[PDB]
Amino acid sequence: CGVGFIAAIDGKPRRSVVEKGIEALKAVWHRGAVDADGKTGDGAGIHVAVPQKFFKDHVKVIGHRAPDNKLAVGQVFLPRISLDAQEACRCIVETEILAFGYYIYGWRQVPINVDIIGEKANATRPEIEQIIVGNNKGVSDEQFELDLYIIRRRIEKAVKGEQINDFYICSLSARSIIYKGMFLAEQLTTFYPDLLDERFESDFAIYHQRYSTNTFPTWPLAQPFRMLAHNGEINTVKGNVNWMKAHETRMEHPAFGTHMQDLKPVIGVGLSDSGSLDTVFEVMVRAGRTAPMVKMMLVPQALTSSQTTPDNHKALIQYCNSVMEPWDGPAALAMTDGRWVVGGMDRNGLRPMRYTITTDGLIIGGSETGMVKIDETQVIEKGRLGPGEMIAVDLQSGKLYRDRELKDHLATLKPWDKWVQNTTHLDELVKTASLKGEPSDMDKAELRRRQQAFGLTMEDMELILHPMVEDGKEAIGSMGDDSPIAVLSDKYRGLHHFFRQNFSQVTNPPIDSLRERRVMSLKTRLGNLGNILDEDETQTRLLQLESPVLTTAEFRAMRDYMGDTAAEIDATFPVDGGPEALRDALRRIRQETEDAVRGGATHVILTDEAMGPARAAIPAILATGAVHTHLIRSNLRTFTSLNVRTAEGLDTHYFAVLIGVGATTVNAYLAQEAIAERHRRGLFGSMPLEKGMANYKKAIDDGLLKIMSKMGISVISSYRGGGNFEAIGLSRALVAEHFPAMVSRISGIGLNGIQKKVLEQHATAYNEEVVALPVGGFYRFRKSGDRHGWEGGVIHTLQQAVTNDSYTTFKKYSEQVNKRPPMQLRDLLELRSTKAPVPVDEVESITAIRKRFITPGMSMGALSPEAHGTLNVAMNRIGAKSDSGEGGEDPARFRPDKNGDNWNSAIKQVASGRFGVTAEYLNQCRELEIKVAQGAKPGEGGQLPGFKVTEMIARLRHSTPGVMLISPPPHHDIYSIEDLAQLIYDLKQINPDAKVTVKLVSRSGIGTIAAGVAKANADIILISGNSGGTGASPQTSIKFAGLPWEMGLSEVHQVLTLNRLRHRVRLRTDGGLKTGRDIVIAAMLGAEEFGIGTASLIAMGCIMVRQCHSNTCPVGVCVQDDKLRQKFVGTPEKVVNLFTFLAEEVREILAGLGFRSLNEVIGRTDLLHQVSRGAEHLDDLDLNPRLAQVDPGENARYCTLQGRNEVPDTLDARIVADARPLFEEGEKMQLAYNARNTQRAIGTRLSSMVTRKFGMFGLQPGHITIRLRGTAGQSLGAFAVQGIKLEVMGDANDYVGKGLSGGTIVVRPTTSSPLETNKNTIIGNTVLYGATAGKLFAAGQAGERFAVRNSGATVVVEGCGSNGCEYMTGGTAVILGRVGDNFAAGMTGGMAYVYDLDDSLPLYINDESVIFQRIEVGHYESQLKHLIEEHVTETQSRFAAEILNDWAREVTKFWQVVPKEMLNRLEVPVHL
Amino acid sequence: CGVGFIAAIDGKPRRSVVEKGIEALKAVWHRGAVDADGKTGDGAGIHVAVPQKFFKDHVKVIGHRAPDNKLAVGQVFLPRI
Ligand SMILES: Cc1cc2nc3c(=O)[nH]c(=O)nc-3n(C[C@H](O)[C@H](O)[C@H](O)COP(=O)(O)O)c2cc1C
Ligand code: F3S
Secondary structure, three states: OOEEEEEEEOOOEEHHHHHHHHHHHHOOOOOOOOOOOOOOOOOOEEEEEEEEEEEHHHHHHHHHOOOOOOEEEEEEEOOHHHHOHHHHHHHHHHHHHOOOOOOOEEEEEOOOOOOOOOOOOOOOEEEEEEEEEEOOOOOOOHHHHHHHHHHHHHHHHHHOOOOOOOOEEEEEEEEEEEEOOOOOOOHHHOOOOOHHOOOOOOOOEEEOOOOOOOOOHHHEEEEEOOOOOOOOOOOOOOOHHHHHHHHHHHOOOOOHHHHHHHOOOOOOOOHHHHHHHHHHHHHHHOOOOOOOHHHHHHOOOOOOOOOOOOOOOOHHHHHHHHHOOOOOOOEEEEEEEEEEEEEEOOOOOOOOOOOEEOOEEEEEEEEEOOOOOOOOEEEEEEEEOOOOEEEEEEEEOEEEEHHHHHHHHHHOOHHHHOOOOOOOHHHHHHHHOOOOOOOOEEEEEEHHHHHOOOOOOOOOHHHHHHHHHHHHOOOOOOOOOOOOOOOOOOOOOHHHHHEEOOOOOOOOOOOOOOOOHHHOOOEEEEEEOOOOOOOOOOOOOOEEEEEOOOOOHHHHHHHHHHHHOOOEEEEEEEEOOOOOHHOOOOOOOHHHHHHHHHOOOOOEEEEOOOOEOOOEOOOOOOOOOOHHHHHHHOHHHHHHHHHEOOOOOOOOHHHHHHHHHOHHHEEEEEHHHHHHHHHHHOOOOOOOOOHHHHHHHHHHHHHHHHHHHHHOOOOOOHHOOEEEEEEEEOOOHHHHOOOOOOOOOOOOOOHHHHHHHHHHHHHHHHHHOOOOOOOOOOOOOOOOOOOOOOHHHHHHHHHHHHHOOOHHHHHHHHHHHHHOOOOOHHOEEEEOOOOOOOOHOOOOOOHHOOOEEOOOOOOOOOHHHHHHHHHHEEEHHHOOOOOOOOOOOOOHHOOOOOOOOOOOOOOOOEEOOOOOOOOOHHHOOOOEEEOOOOOOOOOOOOOOOOOOHHHHHHHOOOEEEEEEOEEEOOOOOOOOOHHHHHHHHHHHHHOOOOOEEEEEOOOOOHHHHHHHHHHHOOOOOEEOOOOOOOOOHHHHHHHOOOOHHHHHHHHHHHHHHOOHHHHOOOEEOOOOOOHHHHHHHHHHOOOEEEEOOHHHHHHHHHOOOOOHOOOOOOOOOOOOHHEEEEEEOOOOHHHHHHHHHHHHHHHHHHHHOOOOOHHHHHOOOOHHEOOOOOOOOOOOOOOHHHHHOOOOOOOOOOOOOOOOOOOEEEEHHHHHOOOOOOOHOOEEEEEEEHHHHHOOOOOOOOHHHHHOOOOOOOOOOOOEEEEOOOOOOOOOOOEEEOOOEEEEOOOOOOOOOOOOOOEEEEEEOOOOOOOOOHEEEEOOOOOOOOOEEEEOOOOOOOOOOOOOOOEEEEEEEEEOOOOOOOOOOOOEEEEEEOOOOOOOOOOOEEEEEEEEOOHHHHHOOOOOEEEEEEOHHHHHHHHHHHHHHHHHHOOOOOOHHHHHHOOOOOOHHHHEEEEOOOOOEEEEEOOO | OOOOOOOOOOOOOOHHHHHHHHHHHHOOOOOOOOOOOOOOOOOOOOOOOOHHHHHHHHHHHHHHOOOOOOOOOOOOOOOOO
C-alpha cells in the first residue's frame, strides 16, 4: 500500500516529473501482496495533467485542425462482452455531449498489453476508450470545467437509469487525466505504453497502490478517484451518507442553476468510503471554494482546548465545525484541484506522511522516504506531517505554503472572529435561572410503581447506580456472563438488551479514551442544519450544548427558552387497543410529527409522561427510530430537531444506543427522582444533591466517550444516527424499516411478542398492589433469578467427578447439563446422521484427539503463579499445547527442574502492551500469538487494579510497583492491513521455527477481515466469542459486546472457502465450550482446534465468587497476597482426568454418530437439523443463514499443508552467510553495506542467531557493527540484542527500535549534506515501541508517538511531536528541540530532559501525573552531561557540540519532567 | 433442443408423470450442444406442480404445525459472491 504526490513549484511542464513519478511507483512492491500467480494485483493508479501537444498532433494526423484553445479527453470503460451495449453507451455519450454545443473530435482506442495481467483479473477487464472534445464557443475555462462536470454527471445518471451495468468514466476534464487499473503496480508502464512517449509532461502527479482485503477485483474501484487520493479507511461512513441525504434538499447555487435539479442524489450507489468522500468533495469544490477551505471543512483540525494557536484560526475552526460534520478515520489525503495541490493528514495523525524538497523547485511526498532516488546534496528540507497539518502548492503563481502561513492566508479571507460570538452557550442560561420552580418529587409508592412498570429491579439501583453517583465512574466486573441472550430470556428484558455495540479490528484502529481526550468532543448544535454551498451569517446563529445528555432543571430551562415552537408528543398507547395497538400507535405518531413539523414547529419533543393504568409507554427507542427515519425519508429532519425524555434508561448503554438512532438530546427524569429519594434517606452520607448529580453527569460523559472511542470515532456529531449496532432476535422487516441500516443476520420476533411482554409487565406492575422492588439476578445468581450457566449443583458435580476420577459421575454431569431448557444458540439444533452406527472399538485413540484441545492464556497479573504453573505443567505433561497470555512469564521456568516437569509454556502472546516481550522471551515457544482484541471486553486493553501489582509482577512486567496498569486499547503497530503484514513478517523473522496466530472476536462482516489476514501469511486464526472470562472490566463491556461465536465462525468458514483460502489457514474456536456435544458441534461447523478456559478452572477449584478484581479470591486462585495463596488445592491430575473424560465422551458420540475420525466430519454442515422450541414462544429464529455452505471442489475442507508458510528474506540472510567466525569461534566483525528502502526489518534474524548461540547479555557491547549507507527500510533493528551496533547514514523509515533489547542504534545524516541537523525530520512515527534495554542516538527530528511504552531504554533526539513519551514506564529520554502538544500522557516512571528556549513547555505539557521543574541536584546534572557527551562523541551533531561547549548558562534553560508517584521511591531527592 | 409436455387426462397426480418427464429429457441429448469439454451445455429445465405433501412433511419436521390450507413455495436466485 502507498500514496504519493510529486509537483513542480513554478509550473512549467517537464518530462522529469512523470519520470520520477513512474520510478517511485516502481518501488512500492515490498508493501504489496505478492501471491503465487505473481501476475494479479489489487489496483494501482497514476494521475497527471493533460498532454495537450500529443493529442493536438494526433488530431492533426487524423486530418482536422488543432484549435487555439485547449482540448478535453474523456476516458471511459465500456462493456466488452456483448456488442449490443457499446453502441448504446456511445449513443448516450454523444447525445449528451452534443446537446450543449461542444464539438466532438473523435474516438481513440488506447493501445494496451494484456499479456502481463493474470487470468482471474482478466475475466472482468472492461474495454478502455477515449473521446476528444474541444471548446469552440470561445467560453472561459472555468465555465468549460463546470459544464463538462455537469455533462459527465448527467451521462452517469442517464446510463444508470437503463440498468446497463459495467460502464465507468475515469475523469472528464481539460486539466487532469487518470491511468488506473487492476494490474500489478510495478508493470504500469507496460500496460499503458502511452506513458512511454517523450511528450506526457505534467506539473503534478499522483500515484497510489491499495491493499484490498478480499480477492475479487473490480476495475472501477481503483484509486485515485476524481480529484482526490486517499490511504486507509474512514470509520464514520454510515452516518455520513444519511446526513448527506438530509443536506441534499437545502442547497442551491446559481453556478448550477437549472441543471442543479439534475444533481439531487449526490452520493451514488456501490462505492467504497473514499468514493463517497470523493463525490462530496468534488460537488463541493465545483461551487467556488478552493481545496484548502474544503479540506478544513471536511476533515477539521482537532480543536485543541488551549491557547497554542492564534484565535483567528480558532474562530475559523469553530465555523468549519459548525458548518459541516467531520469525517474521522485514518487518512493521508493528497487532494489536487486544478489550481492548488494540498497534502494533509486527519485529526489524529495515525498514518505517516513525509515530504522532501529538492534544490530544483521540485516537491515530492509520500509514505516512504527512499522510493524515488534523490541526490544527497540537493535536498533543501526534509519534512514530515503531524495531526491536522497541511502543505499546499499553488501553481497559479508558483508558491509553496507550509502549515502556519497557509492557515493564516486562509483565515485572512473572512472576519471569522466576529461570527463566533453571535451564538450563545447554555451556562449563560443556567446561571440566570431564578431559584424557583421546584417540582414536588413523586411519592415513594409512585416511584416504585413506575419502576416496576419497567422491571427495574433493586440490584440495579445499588450495583451500578450507587458507585456512579458516589465515586464518579462506572462499576467493575470480574468474569464472563452466563445469562442467555435477550431473545431466549424469560423475564421482561429492556429493548436495549437486543443491541450489541460495535468495534473495529485491524481494519480500523481504535483510539484510547484516557490519554487523548483533547481530540474528542460531545458538542451538540441546535439550529445549525441548513445550507452547505452558500456563505452568510445565517449559519452562525444557533445554540451550543456541551453534553448531549441533560438534567431536569436544565431541560426545563431550555424548554422555557424555546418558547412557543416546541411541540410535545405523547409516547403512550392504550393497552386495550387490541392485538395490533402498537402498529396503530406508531402510525399515529409517525403521521402526527410530520403534520406538526410543517405547521410552523421547528422542534419535536417526544415525551412519555402520560403513562397511566390504561395507557402503557411505547418503547422510546422504537418510537425515536420510526420518527427519525420518517423525517429522513420525508426531507424534513433538517427542518427540525428531536429531544427525548425517557423513563427506562439508567446505565450508560441506553443513552448511547438512543443517540445512535438519530435523536439530538436525551433526558432521564426518573433517575434523578430516584437519586433524590435515595439522598434524602441519608444513604450517600453528607454529599449534597448538587455534587452527586454533577458526579453522575461526569460518569455518563465518561461512559459515552468510552463507548464512542470503542469504534474509532472522535466527535459525536458524526456518530448521531450512524447506526453502529448489531441486532439479534428482531424481524428483518422491523429493523430494515424502522431503523436506518442495521444488519440482522437472523430474523426474529416482530411487533407481537414485544407488545405482549410490555403489556404483561405493565399489568403485573400497575394492576396489582406492589410495595417492594424484586431482588432479581442479572449480574449475580439468585434463586428467583433466570437460568445462569454455572449452577451450584453443576460445579459441585463436576468437582466431585474430577476428584473421584469417575466416568459415571462425569456422564451424569454431562446429562445434567444437556437436560436444561435452551440457553444459547447451540441449544436450538440437533445432530442427525444417516449412516450405520460404528462400534466404539474402531474410532481413533484418546491421545490422538487429546492433542487438539488447549487451554487459553491467563495473565500472571490476574492469576496466582501457582495455578499458572499448574495449568502449564498439566497441559505440557500429556503433549498437548498450552498458553501463557499477557503479563510475561518468569525466565527461571524456561528449563525443567529435577522432577522432570517443565513449567515453560508452549505459546507466547503479543498483546498491545508488550510487557515481557524481550529477545529471550520470543525464542522459547513453538507458537506466537497476537492479541488484536480481547474476547470478554473487546475494544479495550488489559486492566489490573492498583494494589494487585506486587514486587514480583512488577519486576516481571518492568513497571513501578503500585499503579493501576491499563494497557492502551490501540495497538500502535497495526493501523491497517499492511502494518499487520509487517508485524507478521517481523515475528516470522525473529523466530525461524514457530508460527504466528491472530485472535479475533465475532461480529458481522468478519469474513472480510478474515480473508484480508489470510493474505498476510498468517496460518492460525483464533475466533473468540462473547462469553469468555477476564480479570477486570466494566459490566457494560461484558454484557454488551460481541456476538456468540456461531455466526462469526460459520461466516469466516464460508468466506475463507469462497476465495480458495481455507486450505492455507487453520481455524480454532473457543468461548463457552463445556461438554462434548458443543465440541462436536463446533468441529461440525468447521473448526479444528479448541479451548476450555473457565471450565478447566472449575476443575482447579474456582467457585465463581466473581470477586477476582479485589485480590480476595477465597479459594486462592486470583490472588497476589501471600495469605490467601496458601489455600490452594490445585492438582494437575484433575486436568488430566478432565481432558481424558472429554476425549472419551467425544469418541463415544462420534462412534454413535456413524463416522470414524474427526478429520472426516469438519465442514459437514448437513449433519445438523434445526429443531423448533415449539409454539410456546412464537419466536422465528431461523439459523439457516449459518448452515449454508459452498462446495469446496478439489482441495480439502481442512488445512492440508505441513510447516509454516514461507516468506521472502531480506538482506540480513546474506549477512549470516558472511558472519561465520562470529558463530564458529566468536571474533569481532565490522561490516558495511548499501541498504535500500525495500529491505524491511534489518538486523533481526542475526539477533535470533545470536540469542540462540550466546543469549542476551553474553557479549561485550559493540561486538559486531554494521554500517548501512542510504536510507533504511521499515522496522529497523527490531529486537536487537546487546552487542550489535547498527550505524545507518541517512534516515529511517518507520518503527525504528521496535522492542529494543540491549542493542545500540545510531542515525546520522551524510556528512556531506548541507542540512542543519535540528531543523529536519530523520525518523518516522512510533519510535522505540516496546523498548526495554538499549541506547538510541538520533541526529534529527522524531516522528509521532515517540518512545511509547519504554521500559528501561535511553534515547536522545532533537525534537518530537504530539503524544511524545505516551504512557512511558521507565528509562531516560533527552529531547533537544521543540516538544509537541500533549507530552508525557500517563507517564508513571522514568524521566524526561527537555531543552526549550521560548518557555513553551508549560504550554504543551500534560500536567496530570508529572511535574516539570528546573535542574537542582548535581547528580542529575552530571548524568545529563555524560549523556550529552556520549551523544556528541557518538554521532557528532553540531547543535549538541555547541550546547556542550557553553555549559554555564544552558542548564538553566533545561527542564526536567518527573512522574508524581515516583517521588517517594527515588534514592536521590530531586528537591533540596 | 426441444420442448415437451406430459399431462393426465383425468387430473389425478402420480409419480409416473415425473418419471416419464425425466425419461423424455434423457433422450434429447443429440440435438443439443456437444463440445470437446463434455460438461457444459446451454441450459434446460422442467416445470411441474407443487407436491404439497413433501413441503408439509418438511414443515412438520421443523417443529411447526402443518396448516390445512395450501402452502405456496418460492424459488429465488440470490447473488452468490
Ligand atoms: C481468568 C481469565 C483470565 C484471562 N486473561 C486473558 C488475558 O489476559 N488476555 C486475553 O486475551 N484473554 C484472557 N482470557 C480469555 C481467554 O483467552 C479465553 O477467551 C477464555 O478462557 C474463554 O473463556 P470460557 O472458558 O468461558 O470459554 C482470560 C480468561 C479468564 C477466565
Ligand atoms: S470468581 Fe475467580 S477468584 Fe476463584 S472462586 Fe471463582 S476463580
